[PDB]
Design a protein around this nucleic acid. Structure first.
Ligand code: K
Ligand code: MG
Ligand code: MG
Ligand code: MG
Ligand code: MG
Ligand code: MG
Ligand code: MG
Ligand code: MG
Ligand code: MG
Ligand code: MG
Ligand code: MG
Ligand code: MG
Ligand code: MG
Ligand code: MG
Ligand code: MG
Ligand code: MG
Ligand code: MG
Ligand code: MG
Ligand code: MG
Ligand code: MG
Ligand code: MG
Ligand code: MG
Ligand code: MG
Ligand code: MG
Ligand code: MG
Ligand code: MG
Ligand code: MG
Ligand code: MG
Ligand code: MG
Ligand code: MG
Ligand code: MG
Ligand code: MG
Ligand code: MG
Ligand code: MG
Ligand code: MG
Ligand code: MG
Ligand code: MG
Ligand code: MG
Ligand code: MG
Ligand code: MG
Ligand code: MG
Ligand code: MG
Ligand code: MG
Ligand code: MG
Ligand code: MG
Ligand code: MG
Ligand code: MG
Ligand code: MG
Ligand code: MG
Ligand code: MG
Ligand code: MG
Ligand code: MG
Ligand code: MG
Ligand code: MG
Ligand code: MG
Ligand code: MG
Ligand code: MG
Ligand code: MG
Ligand code: MG
Ligand code: MG
Ligand code: MG
Ligand code: MG
Ligand code: MG
Ligand code: MG
Ligand code: MG
Ligand code: MG
Ligand code: MG
Ligand code: MG
Ligand code: MG
Ligand code: MG
Ligand code: MG
Ligand code: MG
Ligand code: MG
Ligand code: MG
Ligand code: MG
Ligand code: MG
Ligand code: MG
Ligand code: MG
Ligand code: MG
Ligand code: MG
Ligand code: MG
Ligand code: MG
Ligand code: MG
Ligand code: MG
Ligand code: MG
Ligand code: MG
Ligand code: MG
Ligand code: MG
Ligand code: MG
Ligand code: MG
Ligand code: MG
Ligand code: MG
Ligand code: MG
Ligand code: MG
Ligand code: MG
Ligand code: MG
Ligand code: MG
Ligand code: MG
Ligand code: MG
Ligand code: MG
Ligand code: MG
Ligand code: MG
Ligand code: MG
Ligand code: MG
Ligand code: MG
Ligand code: MG
Ligand code: MG
Ligand code: MG
Ligand code: MG
Ligand code: MG
Ligand code: MG
Ligand code: MG
Ligand code: MG
Ligand code: MG
Ligand code: MG
Ligand code: MG
Ligand code: MG
Ligand code: MG
Ligand code: MG
Ligand code: MG
Ligand code: MG
Ligand code: MG
Ligand code: MG
Ligand code: MG
Ligand code: MG
Ligand code: MG
Ligand code: MG
Ligand code: MG
Ligand code: MG
Ligand code: MG
Ligand code: MG
Ligand code: MG
Ligand code: MG
Ligand code: MG
Ligand code: MG
Ligand code: MG
Ligand code: MG
Ligand code: MG
Ligand code: MG
Ligand code: MG
Ligand code: MG
Ligand code: MG
Ligand code: MG
Ligand code: MG
Ligand code: MG
Ligand code: MG
Ligand code: MG
Ligand code: MG
Ligand code: MG
Ligand code: MG
Ligand code: MG
Ligand code: MG
Ligand code: MG
Ligand code: MG
Ligand code: MG
Ligand code: MG
Ligand code: MG
Ligand code: MG
Ligand code: MG
Ligand code: MG
Ligand code: MG
Ligand code: MG
Ligand code: MG
Ligand code: MG
Ligand code: MG
Ligand code: MG
Ligand code: MG
Ligand code: MG
Ligand code: MG
Ligand code: MG
Ligand code: MG
Ligand code: MG
Ligand code: MG
Ligand code: MG
Ligand code: MG
Ligand code: MG
Ligand code: MG
Ligand code: MG
Ligand code: MG
Ligand code: MG
Ligand code: MG
Ligand code: MG
Ligand code: MG
Ligand code: MG
Ligand code: MG
Ligand code: MG
Ligand code: MG
Ligand code: MG
Ligand code: MG
Ligand code: MG
Ligand code: MG
Ligand code: MG
Ligand code: MG
Ligand code: MG
Ligand code: MG
Ligand code: MG
Ligand code: MG
Ligand code: MG
Ligand code: MG
Ligand code: MG
Ligand code: MG
Ligand code: MG
Ligand code: MG
Ligand code: MG
Ligand code: MG
Ligand code: MG
Ligand code: MG
Ligand code: MG
Ligand code: MG
Ligand code: MG
Ligand code: MG
Ligand code: MG
Ligand code: MG
Ligand code: MG
Ligand code: MG
Ligand code: MG
Ligand code: MG
Ligand code: MG
Ligand code: MG
Ligand code: MG
Ligand code: MG
Ligand code: MG
Ligand code: MG
Ligand code: MG
Ligand code: MG
Ligand code: MG
Ligand code: MG
Ligand code: MG
Ligand code: MG
Ligand code: MG
Ligand code: MG
Ligand code: MG
Ligand code: MG
Ligand code: MG
Ligand code: MG
Ligand code: MG
Ligand code: MG
Ligand code: MG
Ligand code: MG
Ligand code: MG
Ligand code: MG
Ligand code: MG
Ligand code: MG
Ligand code: MG
Ligand code: MG
Ligand code: MG
Ligand code: MG
Ligand code: MG
Ligand code: MG
Ligand code: MG
Ligand code: MG
Ligand code: MG
Ligand code: MG
Ligand code: MG
Ligand code: MG
Ligand code: MG
Ligand code: MG
Ligand code: MG
Ligand code: MG
Ligand code: MG
Ligand code: MG
Ligand code: MG
Ligand code: MG
Ligand code: MG
Ligand code: MG
Ligand code: MG
Lengths: 48, 275
RNA sequence: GCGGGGUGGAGCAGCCUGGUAGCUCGUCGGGCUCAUAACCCGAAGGUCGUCGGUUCAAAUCCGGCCCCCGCAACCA
RNA sequence: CCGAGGGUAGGGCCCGUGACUGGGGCGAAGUCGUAACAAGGUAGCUGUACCGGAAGGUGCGGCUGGAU
RNA sequence: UGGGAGAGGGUGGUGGAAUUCCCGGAGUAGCGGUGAAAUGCGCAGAUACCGGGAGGAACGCCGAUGGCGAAGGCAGCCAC
RNA sequence: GAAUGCCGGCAUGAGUAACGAUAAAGAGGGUGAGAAUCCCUCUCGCCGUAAGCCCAAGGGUUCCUACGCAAUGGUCGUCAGCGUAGGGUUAGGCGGGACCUAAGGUGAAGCCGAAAGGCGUAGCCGAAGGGCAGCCGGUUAAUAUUCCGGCCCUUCCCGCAGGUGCGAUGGGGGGACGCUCUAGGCUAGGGGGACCGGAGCCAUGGACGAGCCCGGCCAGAAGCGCAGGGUGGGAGGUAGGCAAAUCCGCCUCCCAACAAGCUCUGCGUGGUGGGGAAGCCCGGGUGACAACCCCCCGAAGCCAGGGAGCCAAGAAAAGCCUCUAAGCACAACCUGCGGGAACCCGUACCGCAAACCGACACAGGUGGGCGGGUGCAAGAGCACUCAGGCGCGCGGGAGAACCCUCGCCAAGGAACUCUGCAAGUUGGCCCCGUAACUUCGGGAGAAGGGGUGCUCCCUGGGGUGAUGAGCCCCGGGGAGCCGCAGUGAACAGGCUCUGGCGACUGUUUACCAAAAACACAGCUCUCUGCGAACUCGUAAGAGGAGGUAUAGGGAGCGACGCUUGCCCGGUGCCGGAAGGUCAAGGGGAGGGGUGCAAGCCCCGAACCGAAGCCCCGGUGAACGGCGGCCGUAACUAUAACGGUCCUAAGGUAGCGAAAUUCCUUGUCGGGUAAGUUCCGACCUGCACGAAAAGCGUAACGACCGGAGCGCUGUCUCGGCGAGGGACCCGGUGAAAUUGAACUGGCCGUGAAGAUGCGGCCUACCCGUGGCAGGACGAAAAGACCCCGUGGAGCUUUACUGCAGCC
RNA sequence: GAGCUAGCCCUGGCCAGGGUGAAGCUGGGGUGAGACCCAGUGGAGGCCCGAACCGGUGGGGGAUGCAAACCCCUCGGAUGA
RNA sequence: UGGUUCGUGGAGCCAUGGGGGAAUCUGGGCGGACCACCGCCUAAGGCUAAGUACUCCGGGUGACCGAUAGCGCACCAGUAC
């Protein structure tokens, strides 16, 4: 049947993207946390 | 003069539609319409604040002139009478001798090709607009300003009207469509006559589909829900209310008065509504 | 299993707060009426379901026994 | 080919009968009240409506076939 | 062709009397109702009196033993 | 040494289940160390509104070529979407950006919030919507509307010519719009041709034929032709379109009008450029100087912003046109022509799937376009088949039980069973015919029945064309032929009678309930006078609504018909300027502490003092409630009538053993041979009853009852047959489970149901196909029950707070 | 976190073919004029049959599955809420 | 109402959301209600090293671990998945 992951590059970039994070107090702490932990990528990969 | 249908479907049994007799023009004036922004009953938070709204036919808003003292002394001709999906009343197109075009809501009996005018010296004749103080006591009247220059607020729905009962200082006494007696300032404008399309209330929607066309989504009863949802929710099998009848939010809904007690307009309301 | 009842012929007070049995109807005698009823004047009839106890004294307070309605009998 | 009639299916009229049910006629001495005939003790009758154990009552309008 | 009487009918308008209700005034111990009462209304100011307002219905006197209509029926006043 | 412990390793089950759609394979020839599995050829089967082709999304090199086979591939592998390497994606016109706006988002002004932040006009962002200039063929191993060829077009810059009051982010026009139905003429697409072109063919009994087989076009600027869309002209006045205006709007006048003209688009033609089959021979060459014509069918597409009707009344902004303002009129703009200039990103391949979403090369999910032919009434249905694409990545045998899916069956025909569950039957079209009841529509495909192929002859009407031939579309009559059978295969209702519930079409527990539940038009009560009530928010602000009592919120009831009785004592709500109570505050009789004293300091009575509560009323489609005992009639029985107690008042109409009746299979009647169900009645209704509505109701229902006809493998009662498995052989090879095991019956015993203890009995060692009685077999630390001063949802006249409101 | 799912908002798209035959209009009849009746035209509808598409009624299978909801037969809606 | 040891307590002190509202030393605050006396201090402006805390970083040292330990990572780890 129809499953739950239905990929959409616009949807992905606008929801989890770099600029979405920086706009919001909680988004910025995510970046701050993911940097502190040393994540190789702060933000989901999407080809745009 | 409501129109009937033959019982050739279950819904056509009882369904009635307006006759649209008075209508003389069937697509609106392009310079007087702008898009209506459908809300779905949702506010700027995204939240539903009025339940069961949405999904009706698309509409264009027609800009209505509710301040006719805009153009005192300038007469106009009644060019056409049109359907308006945003109100129960019909509307009339006016061609002013000015060259300006405007909509008013159409009063009962108003015939296309007649003149109408607004001002203190205007003839007491259907379609004309005067400050209340210049209208003779006993006159039925509609589209009434509640305060001077603030716009017509009263008696706008199909078939409605207010009647002048007397005068008292700067104020006149009105009997509103509801039956209430109220003082309204004399400088407030009002159009003489009653609003037309009085057969409007005799229309029988006939099926659930017509409610949907009008943007009215299905209304689910409190008794049909669960306790997390409503005072009337729950019960094994059917249940009577088992408490004073309430709204979803807990307040009582048979008789509880809700007008604010210390409201300043109380000084102007003489007698609360009939019936 | 828990609850309330049993008192002139009928239907109900009095029982809680021990000593005092009361109300309407009915019944019996008289009256009015041609006569009956209605109506008026008089009167009689209960030892309080029963046995046992407390008491100076029990319809009454406490225990059985007989009876009468009433409520309950759920989870599998 | 037609054809007595037999068969399948569906209709129409009549008669008889049916748990139970509706009122009706009748029947020497049952129970309830007293509506009508006297102004019958609320004049009566009436079409209709609503109500009531029952006769009946009341409303609206009508008739005199109503007394004084 | 010329005349007349009439609550004949339909429509729109409109006049005063009375009842009820509402606001103001003035005023006090009862009002109402019946065969007699009681229910009811009244010191939270009723009834009775005066001024104001709202609303519906029916048209006193003329009026008659009268008039009109086919019958049912038709009565303030005005116009069509 | 144990913790259903943690991590890792290796066992058992076991050479067992399985190897992923039952569309299907066989042979020959190649390659190679090795071949059912790779390549080629022939034969066979499967899809063909796809299982073919083209987009979009998502994926991200998977594309092409060479060289490879350890792992990946459910077997094999020489092959591959796999390993290694090299190559491959070309645009002014296609799509997006340098254009526009939608919801929404953001947000100079402004507003609000302890902080963080929340709002918000203009503006800006935002697309699969608007706008905007490229069609046909050729070429590569792999890209092509991109490269090439032919023929066309757009914008920008500069220049020349002619013309004009030029000029705007401002004014105006336009853009610009729904649903259903639909005209004319076209194009896409298709059928046929005795005409035109073509390699060839004559078989096996006949045919050298008006034979068979193949093909018979595509694009195109100006001009022209056919068909459409759009659009009146001039003048005078003018106060409106937030400055101006010659524009637009309004008034008058003349002329035009189902036209014409002007303009725009589609189609046809069109200079020119292309393409071009079978068959043979080796993707190519030939065929070929290929021919390229006539008739018919014909769109849902085009002309288009067409026409009609209806109510639920159907985006914006830019491009574009017109008007003018500053300004400037050496300018500037419009038109024609010429030269120059024209950027960034995508483009491979997969794409109903082995490359996307499902952990898998997974029978599942995935939006748009094309989707041929014949026949069946039509069609995207069904059967076969074209182009194209496949046989589904384990095979070979055997011919057991049993399972699955399928076919038939003597006589009977629901006797099966909770239930005709299931499976039969019926089945399309044309004609005949069709009941109760009904809201007059319906019920209705009621029911039931007749017809249906092929051949010859006669004839009626329509479309195209020409009025005729031809082709195509509807028919009518007569005579015959064959079979068991003519919708001859495939697709395609079983019907009737009678109850309950719900009016109806709809909606729901994604994944055990589709229903009588929810919704629904309709009825009623109630709140709300507008800065509405109500809702979300601390607020600002929003919704309500750019609505205004014929409106908006809340509540119950639920089409329609006939109806909806009595109780206001309690609770709720509503009205009540009195009275009672009443907090902070006011008031200060009267005290008190301290000081030498002025004083400073504390307590404090009467009395004035809101809402709320008390108190007086009203109110039921507000919450709710609507009795008991005893007696009585000239047979009996039963009580129309009476007595008395109690209540706020004692259940009315209608209905009733019911979706409600305990006793109960009540009792009587119906149906049956027989009826705990069903239907009709009766009424001592354990425990119906009137908007948590009462009693009915035509139509409707994948709802739940009961009966009958039809027909059947449901059954008596089973039999045979088919394929896929199971079985055997070759290849690959799991799982839960498992204290260890050398693991029998009876009768006893034992913590009370023993392979394991006692006594007896029985038993050579080891497997394979089968069956399920036991191993208190497996799975899941019972979901029932209880216990825990364990948790959570929910309720209220439990307690205590808080929002909100007064 | 609303790329699943529920509702709303904006903007696009889709629904083979066949059946039934409302109003209106026209003509005829009728009447003082009407109502109304008949025929033709017309093409309405939470109308009817049935694909696509949306569902999920009954049964069978599947149950360490092809599948953590699938498959086969049958069945509901299909111009509308 | 908060702070303090102070939970309304005999409740001062410090701070302050609301109302009332002075004085300039003969002014004003405090010494735990309040009063007297006796003392302490000078509010409603502001700045100020050091001694104190921490360890991303560097070094030194362990009756610290020694690849299931020691950081999650001794190794291309905040990676693969
Ligand atoms: K239980
Ligand atoms: Mg699905
Ligand atoms: Mg889903
Ligand atoms: Mg999605
Ligand atoms: Mg996207
Ligand atoms: Mg996208
Ligand atoms: Mg998106
Ligand atoms: Mg976002
Ligand atoms: Mg972003
Ligand atoms: Mg922050
Ligand atoms: Mg890195
Ligand atoms: Mg992130
Ligand atoms: Mg109708
Ligand atoms: Mg009708
Ligand atoms: Mg109208
Ligand atoms: Mg506009
Ligand atoms: Mg709006
Ligand atoms: Mg709005
Ligand atoms: Mg907003
Ligand atoms: Mg938001
Ligand atoms: Mg709401
Ligand atoms: Mg809503
Ligand atoms: Mg409205
Ligand atoms: Mg209107
Ligand atoms: Mg006013
Ligand atoms: Mg209405
Ligand atoms: Mg609407
Ligand atoms: Mg509604
Ligand atoms: Mg509802
Ligand atoms: Mg409920
Ligand atoms: Mg529920
Ligand atoms: Mg919730
Ligand atoms: Mg709650
Ligand atoms: Mg609640
Ligand atoms: Mg409840
Ligand atoms: Mg319930
Ligand atoms: Mg119940
Ligand atoms: Mg209750
Ligand atoms: Mg309540
Ligand atoms: Mg409130
Ligand atoms: Mg009022
Ligand atoms: Mg008594
Ligand atoms: Mg007593
Ligand atoms: Mg006595
Ligand atoms: Mg006597
Ligand atoms: Mg004694
Ligand atoms: Mg004794
Ligand atoms: Mg005694
Ligand atoms: Mg229980
Ligand atoms: Mg039990
Ligand atoms: Mg049990
Ligand atoms: Mg015979
Ligand atoms: Mg007798
Ligand atoms: Mg009488
Ligand atoms: Mg009498
Ligand atoms: Mg009498
Ligand atoms: Mg009498
Ligand atoms: Mg009476
Ligand atoms: Mg006269
Ligand atoms: Mg008094
Ligand atoms: Mg007084
Ligand atoms: Mg009135
Ligand atoms: Mg141990
Ligand atoms: Mg453990
Ligand atoms: Mg472990
Ligand atoms: Mg290891
Ligand atoms: Mg492990
Ligand atoms: Mg291992
Ligand atoms: Mg082993
Ligand atoms: Mg093994
Ligand atoms: Mg085994
Ligand atoms: Mg297996
Ligand atoms: Mg398998
Ligand atoms: Mg299959
Ligand atoms: Mg097949
Ligand atoms: Mg072969
Ligand atoms: Mg082979
Ligand atoms: Mg091989
Ligand atoms: Mg091999
Ligand atoms: Mg091959
Ligand atoms: Mg085909
Ligand atoms: Mg390999
Ligand atoms: Mg090898
Ligand atoms: Mg290999
Ligand atoms: Mg290798
Ligand atoms: Mg492998
Ligand atoms: Mg595999
Ligand atoms: Mg090799
Ligand atoms: Mg390539
Ligand atoms: Mg190009
Ligand atoms: Mg490019
Ligand atoms: Mg540029
Ligand atoms: Mg954006
Ligand atoms: Mg943009
Ligand atoms: Mg776009
Ligand atoms: Mg373009
Ligand atoms: Mg072109
Ligand atoms: Mg080509
Ligand atoms: Mg412009
Ligand atoms: Mg438009
Ligand atoms: Mg528009
Ligand atoms: Mg549009
Ligand atoms: Mg429509
Ligand atoms: Mg063409
Ligand atoms: Mg086509
Ligand atoms: Mg064809
Ligand atoms: Mg052809
Ligand atoms: Mg051409
Ligand atoms: Mg002007
Ligand atoms: Mg000019
Ligand atoms: Mg050649
Ligand atoms: Mg289409
Ligand atoms: Mg075309
Ligand atoms: Mg078009
Ligand atoms: Mg806009
Ligand atoms: Mg100038
Ligand atoms: Mg110059
Ligand atoms: Mg020009
Ligand atoms: Mg650039
Ligand atoms: Mg490409
Ligand atoms: Mg598919
Ligand atoms: Mg597709
Ligand atoms: Mg593939
Ligand atoms: Mg893959
Ligand atoms: Mg496969
Ligand atoms: Mg698949
Ligand atoms: Mg073809
Ligand atoms: Mg067919
Ligand atoms: Mg195969
Ligand atoms: Mg095999
Ligand atoms: Mg075998
Ligand atoms: Mg078998
Ligand atoms: Mg099969
Ligand atoms: Mg079979
Ligand atoms: Mg056979
Ligand atoms: Mg048989
Ligand atoms: Mg049979
Ligand atoms: Mg038979
Ligand atoms: Mg049976
Ligand atoms: Mg059996
Ligand atoms: Mg069953
Ligand atoms: Mg069959
Ligand atoms: Mg069939
Ligand atoms: Mg019948
Ligand atoms: Mg019939
Ligand atoms: Mg019936
Ligand atoms: Mg009928
Ligand atoms: Mg038929
Ligand atoms: Mg025939
Ligand atoms: Mg034949
Ligand atoms: Mg069928
Ligand atoms: Mg029958
Ligand atoms: Mg029937
Ligand atoms: Mg239903
Ligand atoms: Mg239902
Ligand atoms: Mg019902
Ligand atoms: Mg009904
Ligand atoms: Mg209903
Ligand atoms: Mg439907
Ligand atoms: Mg449904
Ligand atoms: Mg479910
Ligand atoms: Mg569930
Ligand atoms: Mg579930
Ligand atoms: Mg199920
Ligand atoms: Mg259910
Ligand atoms: Mg259903
Ligand atoms: Mg539901
Ligand atoms: Mg409902
Ligand atoms: Mg319904
Ligand atoms: Mg109703
Ligand atoms: Mg109403
Ligand atoms: Mg709130
Ligand atoms: Mg608004
Ligand atoms: Mg009826
Ligand atoms: Mg009450
Ligand atoms: Mg009361
Ligand atoms: Mg009350
Ligand atoms: Mg002293
Ligand atoms: Mg008070
Ligand atoms: Mg009660
Ligand atoms: Mg009644
Ligand atoms: Mg019964
Ligand atoms: Mg029975
Ligand atoms: Mg019943
Ligand atoms: Mg019951
Ligand atoms: Mg029973
Ligand atoms: Mg029973
Ligand atoms: Mg029986
Ligand atoms: Mg009997
Ligand atoms: Mg019987
Ligand atoms: Mg009985
Ligand atoms: Mg109720
Ligand atoms: Mg109930
Ligand atoms: Mg029915
Ligand atoms: Mg029914
Ligand atoms: Mg249904
Ligand atoms: Mg159903
Ligand atoms: Mg049955
Ligand atoms: Mg049966
Ligand atoms: Mg069998
Ligand atoms: Mg069989
Ligand atoms: Mg077999
Ligand atoms: Mg092997
Ligand atoms: Mg292997
Ligand atoms: Mg062992
Ligand atoms: Mg052993
Ligand atoms: Mg053994
Ligand atoms: Mg053994
Ligand atoms: Mg034992
Ligand atoms: Mg044993
Ligand atoms: Mg043994
Ligand atoms: Mg042992
Ligand atoms: Mg031993
Ligand atoms: Mg032993
Ligand atoms: Mg032994
Ligand atoms: Mg033995
Ligand atoms: Mg074996
Ligand atoms: Mg075995
Ligand atoms: Mg076993
Ligand atoms: Mg077993
Ligand atoms: Mg066992
Ligand atoms: Mg065990
Ligand atoms: Mg067992
Ligand atoms: Mg389990
Ligand atoms: Mg546990
Ligand atoms: Mg446990
Ligand atoms: Mg458990
Ligand atoms: Mg459970
Ligand atoms: Mg237990
Ligand atoms: Mg406790
Ligand atoms: Mg405890
Ligand atoms: Mg607890
Ligand atoms: Mg989505
Ligand atoms: Mg459709
Ligand atoms: Mg038909
Ligand atoms: Mg017709
Ligand atoms: Mg028409
Ligand atoms: Mg339909
Ligand atoms: Mg049909
Ligand atoms: Mg299913
Ligand atoms: Mg079945
Ligand atoms: Mg199967
Ligand atoms: Mg399952
Ligand atoms: Mg399936
Ligand atoms: Mg099927
Ligand atoms: Mg079906
Ligand atoms: Mg259908
Ligand atoms: Mg359809
Ligand atoms: Mg503290
Ligand atoms: Mg303190
Ligand atoms: Mg302060
Ligand atoms: Mg001092
Ligand atoms: Mg001082
Ligand atoms: Mg201080
Ligand atoms: Mg101090
Ligand atoms: Mg000090
Ligand atoms: Mg100082
Ligand atoms: Mg200092
Ligand atoms: Mg320091
Ligand atoms: Mg290690
Ligand atoms: Mg480690
Ligand atoms: Mg270690
Ligand atoms: Mg570190
Ligand atoms: Mg580690
Ligand atoms: Mg590194
Ligand atoms: Mg790594």
């Amino acid at each position: 049947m129809k499953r739950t992951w239905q990929p959409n590059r616009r949807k992905r970039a606008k929801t989890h993207g770099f600029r979405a994070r920086m706009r919001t107090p909680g988004g910025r702490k995510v970046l701050k946390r993911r940097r502190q932990k040393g994540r190789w990528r702060l933000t989901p990969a999407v080809r745009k | 003069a409501v129109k009937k249908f033959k019982p050739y479907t279950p819904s056509r049994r009882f369904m009635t539609v307006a006759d649209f007799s008075e209508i003389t023009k069937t697509e609106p004036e392009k310079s007087l319409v702008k898009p209506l922004k459908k809300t779905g009953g949702r506010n700027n938070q995204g939240r539903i604040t009025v339940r069961f709204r949405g999904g009706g036919h698309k509409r264009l808003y027609r800009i209505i002139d509710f301040k006719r003292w805009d153009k005192v002394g300038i007469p106009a001709k009644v060019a056409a009478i049109e359907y308006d999906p945003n109100r129960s009343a019909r509307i009339a197109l006016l061609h002013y001798v000015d060259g300006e075009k405007r909509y008013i809501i159409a009063p009962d009996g108003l015939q296309v090709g007649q003149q109408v005018v607004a001002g203190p010296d205007a003839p007491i004749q259907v379609g004309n607009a005067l400050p209340l103080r210049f209208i003779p006591v006993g006159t039925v009247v509609h589209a009434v300003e509640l305060e001077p220059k603030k716009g017509a607020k009263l008696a706008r729905a199909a078939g409605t009207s207010a009647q002048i009962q007397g005068r008292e200082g700067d104020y006149v006494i009105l009997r509103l469509p509801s039956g209430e007696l109220r003082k309204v300032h004399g400088e407030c404008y009002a159009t003489v006559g009653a609003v037309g399309n009085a057969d409007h209330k005799n229309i029988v929607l006939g099926k659930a589909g017509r409610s949907r066309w009008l943007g009215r989504r299905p209304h689910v009863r409190g008794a049909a829900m669960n306790p997390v949802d409503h005072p009337h929710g729950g019960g094994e099998g059917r249940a009577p209310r088992g408490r004073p009848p309430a709204s979803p939010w807990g307040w009582q809904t048979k008789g509880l008065k809700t007008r604010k007690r210390r409201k300043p307009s109380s000084r102007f309301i003489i007698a609360r509504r009939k019936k």
